[PDB]
Amino acid sequence: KAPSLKFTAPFGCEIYTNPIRAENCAVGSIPLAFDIPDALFTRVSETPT
Amino acid sequence: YKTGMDSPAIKCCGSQECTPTYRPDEQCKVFTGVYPFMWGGAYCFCDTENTQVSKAYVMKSDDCLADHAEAYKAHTASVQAFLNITVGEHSIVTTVYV
Amino acid sequence: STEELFNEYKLTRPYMARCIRCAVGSCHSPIAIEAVKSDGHDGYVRLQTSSQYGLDSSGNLKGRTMRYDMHGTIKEIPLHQVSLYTSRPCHIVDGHGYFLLARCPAGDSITMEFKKDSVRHSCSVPYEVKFNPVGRELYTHPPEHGVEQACQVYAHDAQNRGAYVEMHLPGSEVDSSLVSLSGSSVTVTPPDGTSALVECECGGTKISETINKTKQFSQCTKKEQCRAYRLQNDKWVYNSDKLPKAAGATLKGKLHVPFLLADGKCTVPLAPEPMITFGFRSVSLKLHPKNPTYLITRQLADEPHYTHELISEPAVRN
Amino acid sequence: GLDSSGNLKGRTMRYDMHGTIKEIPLHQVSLYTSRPCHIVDGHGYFLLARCPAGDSITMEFKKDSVRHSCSVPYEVKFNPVGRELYTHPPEHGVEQACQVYAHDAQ
Amino acid sequence: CTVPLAPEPMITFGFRSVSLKLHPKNPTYLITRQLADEPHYTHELISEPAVRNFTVTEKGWEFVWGNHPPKRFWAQETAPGNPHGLPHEVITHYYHRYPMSTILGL
Amino acid sequence: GDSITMEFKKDSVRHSCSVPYEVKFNPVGRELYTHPPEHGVEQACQVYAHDAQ
Amino acid sequence: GAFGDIQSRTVSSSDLYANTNLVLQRPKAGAIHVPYTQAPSGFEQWKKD
Amino acid sequence: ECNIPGNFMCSNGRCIPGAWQCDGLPDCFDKSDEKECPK
Amino acid sequence: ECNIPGNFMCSNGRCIPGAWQCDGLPDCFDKSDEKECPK
Numbered sequence A: 001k002a003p004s005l006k007f008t009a010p011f012g013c014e015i016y017t018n019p020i021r022a023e024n025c026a027v028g029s030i031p032l033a034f035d036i037p038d039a040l041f042t043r044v045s046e047t048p049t
Numbered sequence B: 001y002k003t004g005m006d007s008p009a010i011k012c013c014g015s016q017e018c019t020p021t022y023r024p025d026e027q028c029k030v031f032t033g034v035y036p037f038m039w040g041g042a043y044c045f046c047d048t049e050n051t052q053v054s055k056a057y058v059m060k061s062d063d064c065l066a067d068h069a070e071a072y073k074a075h076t077a078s079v080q081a082f083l084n085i086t087v088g089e090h091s092i093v094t095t096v097y098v
Numbered sequence C: 001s002t003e004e005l006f007n008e009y010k011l012t013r014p015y016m017a018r019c020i021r022c023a024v025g026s027c028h029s030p031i032a033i034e035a036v037k038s039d040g041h042d043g044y045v046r047l048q049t050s051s052q053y054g055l056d057s058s059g060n061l062k063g064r065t066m067r068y069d070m071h072g073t074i075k076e077i078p079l080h081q082v083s084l085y086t087s088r089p090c091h092i093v094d095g096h097g098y099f100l101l102a103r104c105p106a107g108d109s110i111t112m113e114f115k116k117d118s119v120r121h122s123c124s125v126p127y128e129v130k131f132n133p134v135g136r137e138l139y140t141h142p143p144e145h146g147v148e149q150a151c152q153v154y155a156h157d158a159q160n161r162g163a164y165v166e167m168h169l170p171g172s173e174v175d176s177s178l179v180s181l182s183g184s185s186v187t188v189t190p191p192d193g194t195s196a197l198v199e200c201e202c203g204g205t206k207i208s209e210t211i212n213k214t215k216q217f218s219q220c221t222k223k224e225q226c227r228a229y230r231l232q233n234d235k236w237v238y239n240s241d242k243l244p245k246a247a248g249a250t251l252k253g254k255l256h257v258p259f260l261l262a263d264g265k266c267t268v269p270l271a272p273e274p275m276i277t278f279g280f281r282s283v284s285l286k287l288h289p290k291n292p293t294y295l296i297t298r299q300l301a302d303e304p305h306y307t308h309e310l311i312s313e314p315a316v317r318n
Numbered sequence D: 001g002l003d004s005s006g007n008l009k010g011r012t013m014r015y016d017m018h019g020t021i022k023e024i025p026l027h028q029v030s031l032y033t034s035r036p037c038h039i040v041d042g043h044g045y046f047l048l049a050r051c052p053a054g055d056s057i058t059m060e061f062k063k064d065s066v067r068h069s070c071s072v073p074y075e076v077k078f079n080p081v082g083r084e085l086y087t088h089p090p091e092h093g094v095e096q097a098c099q100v101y102a103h104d105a106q
Numbered sequence E: 001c002t003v004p005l006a007p008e009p010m011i012t013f014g015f016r017s018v019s020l021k022l023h024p025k026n027p028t029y030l031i032t033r034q035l036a037d038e039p040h041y042t043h044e045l046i047s048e049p050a051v052r053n054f055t056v057t058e059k060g061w062e063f064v065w066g067n068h069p070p071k072r073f074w075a076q077e078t079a080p081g082n083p084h085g086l087p088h089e090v091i092t093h094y095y096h097r098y099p100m101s102t103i104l105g106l
Numbered sequence F: 001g002d003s004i005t006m007e008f009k010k011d012s013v014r015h016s017c018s019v020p021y022e023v024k025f026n027p028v029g030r031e032l033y034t035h036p037p038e039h040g041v042e043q044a045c046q047v048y049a050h051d052a053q
Numbered sequence G: 001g002a003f004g005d006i007q008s009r010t011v012s013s014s015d016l017y018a019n020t021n022l023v024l025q026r027p028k029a030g031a032i033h034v035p036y037t038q039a040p041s042g043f044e045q046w047k048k049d
Numbered sequence H, I: 001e002c003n004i005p006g007n008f009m010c011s012n013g014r015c016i017p018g019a020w021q022c023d024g025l026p027d028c029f030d031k032s033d034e035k036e037c038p039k
């Protein structure tokens, strides 16, 4: 049967069964976008100088 | 060698405290959450707040007295020779150093 | 004759321990083997069991029987009934107290068994058994004929001067069979001959230390709500890792053990004489081993060019 | 597992002795491959036992006469549980998932 | 099932390298991998004591030994580094830091 | 096996004796089997007759 | 696991040096026993090699 | 645990064949497999 | 010689356990281990 994919998968990818899935695969990057309303911003006059 | 293992210190419905022990390679650790069983039934009633202390140490094997290796350091060696020397029909057995 | 044969046996008493497999699953049987030594070159095994034998229940010298702790009581059966094997049946040689000397063959594990008054009981423990043949020739069994060479083997003599082990008082031995609900309350027998140590986790009375009295315990709906221990406090036990220790005190001493490893003489095979063929700056050797035999050669010069090989099949080397 | 009348008796085993059918205690029946096996349980046609590794299975029992035996060729080689190749289970270890034959008659 | 636990090896540290002292009680599978795009997966069933050396980069290296829970070790600048060291010296010290080039720039 | 052990029960402790002798029987045919198969073809061989003749 | 894991200054010396890497383990629930971890006897390994 | 499933746990924690639960034999050695047996 | 030491030599030269010397059993098979036994 040879060593399993779990042991041979690159990028330190860990393989788990039942809901077949890969975890902790350290490759690449992910862009993020944050639509935040202006209501949550705080004016400098309320913060210490 | 033989691994000397002490009898488990099982405290039922309570907690033990570990103490220093002066034995070669002596290890001791406290374990909680144990419900030991014996041939006569469950040893401890309580399911929690139970303490089982395990202690072990390393001791020489009883066979070591006869079967053992001895590590030596050697230096500055001297040679002793046994020469049969006959000088003019005088046969002798000579034990003499070199 | 002499304390070595009188034995500390009168002070000790055999005990029980857990076996990995007792046939159908694990159990707390006295047959349990604590440790096995295999240093002797002649192939004899020195097993240390949890039980003791060689002396009967009264302390009389009787090597024909063996003593085992059958749960709440102690029973004895003839030693000849006890059998053991690793790959093939072993031959029991001698025994004294906890220790057993037998001729076992090579194998991967040791199984010991004996016939009770019911279904036979057995116990297997994992231990690598591999005895080094005496000499430079690797044999399985000693030959009919050979030369005498020095070796180290386990003496069967009960004489003991060097080695000794620590034994101490056993801890409290729980026994749930002591307790029942007579009509509706906890009732515990001491029993007749043993002190009953009883303590309850629930309220009311949580300490008994009842020496000899049949007591009823209220506020205990079920017998499962109480626990009861058999205390002997009469004899010592080997410092086993499967019996819990007594917390109050550990009365201990040094007691010597039989079957000491000692120097001796062994019968070893003699490597068949090879045929020697002569030539120019060369010697031809016709090897014809009866078994795997180590060939070693060297020069007498400053450069020995030491060469060695274990050769089991006929071959001619120059 | 059941006697000639259909009563529950696991102590005995039932075998067809030519023109008649006889029964003997189960504890008398022994089997081995390289070393003697330990019978665990049984029910009807099937038998569950602890056998060691070996190249063939030999089963035998004592009749009222010369003992009878039968050997059949079958490769027996059990895969140790885990990434460590052991012969017998250790005294101590960690608990890992495995697949085993249940002895339950269910 | 109850399974044996692979004995804990001795771990020796060094420059971009980890020294592992294996001492198995029985034939135990050793498996290792890198956390990079090129795992260079290497495995071996080892039954006799032996010391093997593996190269570890800052990208990461994973270690699995028998049934012991997997452990991971990463590497970082060990020695000789890049001190001030005027003059010379630092030229060869820089050789070890950020290899695959270095000599190219010189 | 590597040796032959023979034993019998006396009126006392059982007696046994082992002698060293290489036992290794050549399987009949060009196929190396441990035990004879349930089914197969008939080939010539040389075997020890049990007949007292 | 190496030759000389158990050392004794003299045969009769009671004090001795021991380095076996002894590690105690968690016992089984419902079972009384002393679990342990130790390196194989280095004496035996040396005797083999 | 034991040989899952079927191993009826005794009072002393030993595991027995489930076919020996309430069979008229003392397999646990403390009678716990033969106590409380339904009719 | 035999398993040195302990092997009490019988009259026929057989070696027996030293614990079976003067134990009330005929282990040599010629009674020589049980003859001349001190009280």
Ligand SMILES: *[C@@H]1O[C@H](CO)[C@@H](O)[C@H](O)[C@H]1NC(C)=O
Pocket (backbone or CB within 6 Å): B084, B085, B086, B091, B092
């Ligand atoms: C030399 O020594 C041998 C034995 O050591 C002895 O037999 C012999 O007589 C001696 N020869 C002379 C000339 O002394």
Ligand SMILES: *[C@@H]1O[C@H](CO)[C@@H](O)[C@H](O)[C@H]1NC(C)=O
Pocket (backbone or CB within 6 Å): C277, C278, C279, C282, C283, C284, C317, C318
């Ligand atoms: C040495 O070995 C060669 C072949 O390996 C063989 O032909 C030769 O006969 C051998 N030498 C002698 C003196 O037999």
Ligand SMILES: *[C@@H]1O[C@H](CO)[C@@H](O)[C@H](O)[C@H]1NC(C)=O
Pocket (backbone or CB within 6 Å): E012, E013, E014, E017, E018, E019, E052, E053
């Ligand atoms: C790596 O292996 C070599 C020989 O194979 C050895 O000399 C060296 O000590 C090992 N590395 C370390 C850090 O021990």
Ligand SMILES: [Ca+2]
Pocket (backbone or CB within 6 Å): H020, H021, H022, H023, H024, H025, H026, H027, H028, H033, H034
């Ligand atoms: Ca039953």
Ligand SMILES: [Ca+2]
Pocket (backbone or CB within 6 Å): I020, I021, I022, I023, I024, I025, I026, I027, I028, I033, I034
């Ligand atoms: Ca006698």
